[PDB]
Structure 1
C-alpha cells in the first residue's frame, strides 16, 4: 500500500508546513506538522486547557468509535524556554493520504506551551524520527511510519517541500517524475534517534567548494539551516552589510541585498539552495533589516538541515533495516 498527501506552507515565509491527517472513526481531519526531528504524534484535543486553545482544530476522542484510552500512559516533550507539552495517550485509527494505520498512539495534549497556542494553523505534530525518541511512559510507542512499514510497498517516505508553494509527502513509493537526474544516497546514523548524516562540504555562491565533513540531521520540523560558526561566517561575509545581532539573535542583512546561493554536498553530488530561499523577511514590520535563513548551530549543539535546505531537494527517507537518506535535485 501507499499514501500521498499535499503539504502547504502556513504563511508567506514558509515557517512551517501543515499536512491534513484523518484521525478516528468517523474521520476527524487535523492539520499536522510533519516533523522528522521528533517521534511523537500529539494533537490539540478536547482535553487541552481551554485557555491554551486559540483557533486550532481539536481531536475529540469521545466522538471516535475506535479511540481507546491507553491506561496510565503519559507523555511529555520538552522545549526551549523550559516550556513543555504533555498529556495522556489514546490509540486510534490514523490515515495519511489514503494510507491507514490502526492502533496508532495518538497523544492528547492536556497542556501546551504558549508558542503552540499562538500558532492557530498547526493542530499538532506527526513525528517521523526513529521510535527510540518517543516520550510515552512507561510503554514507549511507535511512530506512524514504523506502524505503517510492514504494509508499505517500499519502506520509504519522501519529502518534496515547496518554495512558497504546496508540496508532497509520499509514503511507500518514490515518484520518479518529481526529480531530475539521479538520487544520491548517503549513510544514516541512528545512534541519537535522528535522521543523522554527514554532508561532504559546502560552497558560497560561485566560490570554490570546500571539502569538509558536516554532521547534521534532516529535520522537516525546523525552519532554518543551522551550521557551524565557521561556515555561517563565510556565507554572510559575502553579503554587504550583514552582521550578527545579539538583540535579534542571529545574522541579519539589509533587505535590499541580493543573497548568494548556498551549496551543500551529498557524497559527490551537490544541492544548490537559491539565495532567495535564505531571505526570511524583515525582523519587524516596516524594518529595513531582514532575517537570514542560515544561522549558527553553536548554541544548539547539533547541525540542522531544516526546511531551508530540504525544500531545495527531493529527499528520500529510506527506512530499510540499514536506513539511508537520498537527495536529488528538482
Structure 2
C-alpha cells in the first residue's frame, strides 16, 4: 500500500504545516501537524476542557462506530518549546492520503497548554519519530508509520515541504519526479528516539564550505534551524545590523536586508537554503526588526534541522531495519 497527502503552511511565514487526517467511521477529518520529532498522535476532542478549545476541529469518539476506549491508558507530553497536552486514549481507524491503519492509538486531549489553544489551525499532532518516545502509559503505543510499515510497498515516508506553498507527505514510495539529481543517504542513530544524523558541514552564502560534524535531528515539527552558536554567529555576521537580542529571544536583523543562503552537508552532497527561507518577518506587527530563521541551539541540548532546512530538500525517512535518512535537492 501507499499514501500521499498534501501538507499546507498554517500562515504566511510557514510557522507550521498541517495535513488532513481521517479518523473514525464515518471519517472525521482533522488537520494535524506531522512531527518527526515526537511519537504521539493526539487530537483536540470532545473531551478537551472547553475553555482550552478556540476554533479547532475536534474528534468525537462517541460518534465513531470503530472507536474503542483503550482502558486505563493515559498520555502526557511536554515539547521542547514548553507546550504540553495530556488525556486518555482510543483506538480507531486512521487514514492519511488513502493509506489506512486500523487499531491506531488516537490520544484524546483532556488538557492542552495555551499555545495549542491559541493556534486555531492545528487540530493535533501526528508523531513520526520512533515509537520508543510514545508517552502512552502503562502500555506504550506505536506511531502511525510503525503500524503501517509492514503493509507499505517500501518501509519509508518522505517529506517535501514547500516554501510559502503546499507540499507533500508520501508513505510507502519515493516519488522520483519530486527531486533533482540523486538522493544522498546518511546514517541515523535511534538511541534518543529521533531521526538523528550527522551533517558534514556548512557554508554561508558564497563562502567556502567548512567541513565539520554537526549532529542533529530531522524535525518537521520545529519551524526553525537550530545549530551551534559558532555556526549561527558566522551566518549572522554576514548580515549588516543583525544581532542576538536577549529581549526578543534570538537573532534579529533589519527587515530591509537581503539574507545570504545557508548550505548544509549531507555526506559529500550539499543542500542550499535560499536566504529568503531564513526571513521570519517582523518581530511584532509593524516593526522593522525581523526574526531570523537560523538560531542557536545552545541550551536546547540538541541541534535541530527543522522546517527551514527540511523545506529546501526532498527528505526520505527510511524505516528499514537499519533506518537511514535521504536528502535530495529539488
How does the TM-score come out when normalised to structure 1? 0.99
CA 323–203 in structure 1, closer or farther in 2 if over 3 Å, else same:
same
* Aligned Cα root-mean-square deviation (Å): 0.7
- For residues 306 and 244 of structure 1, the distance between their equivalents in structure 2, rounded to whole angstroms, comes to 20
- For residues 54 and 262 of structure 1, the distance between their equivalents in structure 2, rounded to whole angstroms, comes to 38
Deviation at 1:84, TM superposition (A): 2.7
**Secondary structure at 2:234 match in 1:** helix
CA 82–181 in structure 1, closer or farther in 2 if over 3 Å, else same:
closer
- For residues 115 and 200 of structure 2, the distance between their equivalents in structure 1, rounded to whole angstroms, comes to 35
**Secondary structure at 1:148 match in 2:** helix
| 1:185 equivalent in alignment to 2:201 | no
After superposition, what is the alpha-carbon deviation per residue over 1:63-104, rounded to whole angstroms, capped at 9, x for unaligned?
A: 000000000000000145765310000000000000000000
- For residues 233 and 197 of structure 2, the distance between their equivalents in structure 1, rounded to whole angstroms, comes to 22
Deviation at 1:329, TM superposition (A): 0.3
**Secondary structure at 1:198 match in 2:** strand
Count of residues paired in the alignment: 330
After superposition, what is the alpha-carbon deviation per residue over 1:36-56, rounded to whole angstroms, capped at 9, x for unaligned?
A: 000000000000000000000
Contact 2:83 2:116 in 1 (8 A): no
- For residues 92 and 76 of structure 1, the distance between their equivalents in structure 2, rounded to whole angstroms, comes to 19
After superposition, what is the alpha-carbon deviation per residue over 1:92-131, rounded to whole angstroms, capped at 9, x for unaligned?
A: 0000000000000000000000000000000000000000
CA 39–176 in structure 1, closer or farther in 2 if over 3 Å, else same:
same
Runs of 4+ in 1 over 3 A off after TM superposition: 79-83
Uncovered stretches (5+) of structure 2, i.e. residues with no partner: none
- For residues 24 and 248 of structure 1, the distance between their equivalents in structure 2, rounded to whole angstroms, comes to 42
How does the TM-score come out when normalised to structure 2? 0.99
Q: Map of 1:1-330 to 2, 5 A cutoff?
A: 1-79=1-79, 83-330=83-330
After superposition, what is the alpha-carbon deviation per residue over 1:213-245, rounded to whole angstroms, capped at 9, x for unaligned?
A: 000000000000000000000000000000000
**Secondary structure at 1:232 match in 2:** helix
CA 32–133 in structure 1, closer or farther in 2 if over 3 Å, else same:
same
